[PDB]
């Protein structure tokens, strides 16, 4: 079941994606980022994959269907 | 090909899944096309003496 579940997330990690810039972390759970779409977002950081090298300043991708930081 | 993407060329991508449906050949601005065809002169392009 774990192997079947991981499959499901990979699909989301992949396109469609919309790019942003990741400013800074206010929680390990959820973080604040800014898009190129003209919206500032509070987006959730995907679990059972690192969220602790997520935290520095970098370019980041957010999923189009789910509006999360995959 | 992966050569159907190179910086500055046009691409069509699907709206709902953002994967490449096709190559889209780049637009040619009509303004550049006018500059290529037209010669603003009405004088010889061989020589003008003393020039």
From Swiss-Prot, chain A:
Component of the 19S proteasome regulatory particle complex. The 26S proteasome consists of a 20S core particle (CP) and two 19S regulatory subunits (RP). The regulatory particle is made of a lid composed of 9 subunits, a base containing 6 ATPases including PSMC4 and few additional components. Interacts with NR1I3. Interacts with PAAF1. Interacts with TRIM5. Interacts with ZFAND1. The gene is Psmc4. It comes from Rattus norvegicus. The chain holds residues 71 to 140 of 418 of the full protein. This is 26S proteasome regulatory subunit 6B. It comes from the Eukaryota. It is found in: Cytoplasm; Nucleus. Signal peptide: none annotated. Component of the 26S proteasome, a multiprotein complex involved in the ATP-dependent degradation of ubiquitinated proteins. This complex plays a key role in the maintenance of protein homeostasis by removing misfolded or damaged proteins, which could impair cellular functions, and by removing proteins whose functions are no longer required. Therefore, the proteasome participates in numerous cellular processes, including cell cycle progression, apoptosis, or DNA damage repair. Belongs to the AAA ATPase family.
